Amino acid sequence: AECSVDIQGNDQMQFNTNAITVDKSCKQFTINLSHPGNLPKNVMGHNFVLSTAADMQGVVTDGMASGLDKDYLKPDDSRVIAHTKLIGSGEKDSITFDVSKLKEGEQYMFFCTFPGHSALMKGTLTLK
Ligand SMILES: [Cu+2]
């Protein structure tokens, strides 16, 4: 099965998917994030951040509080399973994480932690 997904974040605070399934036969899983919009990171930064559904709002809230200098994630946040950099117009960043960090049954969310983006920029991820 495939163990990679391409995802874009744009100038209208939208991700171009809101559902990812990770095949259980994948040992690693890669996210390729890009930003085909015009706006820079300090205005319309997007990251791909992954947590349990339960942990999402805390990571977002503490992330807002951490500020731009920290890519809007709180330092040493163990709730974050994986994440990309926060990127701006025309940038790219990819990450690969260990699929064994995930667990069958559990619900995961991906989302952007730039202030106010997570209402519109979020989706589910599920080991299947
Ligand atoms: Cu964003």
Side-chain angles (χ1 to χ4, degrees):
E2 308 155 51
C3 309
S4 201
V5 59
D6 299 358
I7 173 162
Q8 315 178 341
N10 81 358
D11 281 343
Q12 293 300 316
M13 294 157 46
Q14 298 159 309
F15 274 140
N16 66 348
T17 163
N18 74 332
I20 290 170
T21 53
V22 172
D23 193 285
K24 179 180 163 248
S25 67
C26 295
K27 296 265 100 180
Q28 73 177 36
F29 196 89
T30 293
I31 292 99
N32 304 310
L33 179 69
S34 44
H35 196 334
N38 287 323
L39 294 174
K41 161 199 305 178
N42 67 55
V43 174
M44 190 61 64
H46 300 313
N47 49 18
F48 175 97
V49 178
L50 178 67
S51 75
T52 54
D55 284 333
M56 173 181 162
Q57 202 56 26
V59 173
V60 169
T61 296
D62 294 337
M64 176 145 180
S66 281
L68 184 77
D69 269 351
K70 269 124 178 182
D71 269 20
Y72 299 101
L73 293 169
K74 182 190 62 193
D76 313 306
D77 189 339
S78 42
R79 299 169 296 194
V80 183
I81 291 166
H83 64 95
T84 60
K85 280 193 298 186
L86 177 80
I87 65 176
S89 154
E91 303 184 288
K92 256 194 145 164
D93 191 48
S94 285
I95 55 97
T96 304
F97 65 84
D98 206 310
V99 174
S100 50
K101 295 279 188 48
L102 305 188
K103 282 111 211 330
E104 265 171 311
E106 183 58 271
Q107 256 62 75
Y108 298 97
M109 298 298 287
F110 61 95
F111 53 91
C112 172
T113 64
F114 191 88
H117 290 200
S118 65
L120 292 67
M121 305 195 70
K122 63 172 176 228
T124 47
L125 184 142
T126 43
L127 197 45
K128 257 163 64 210

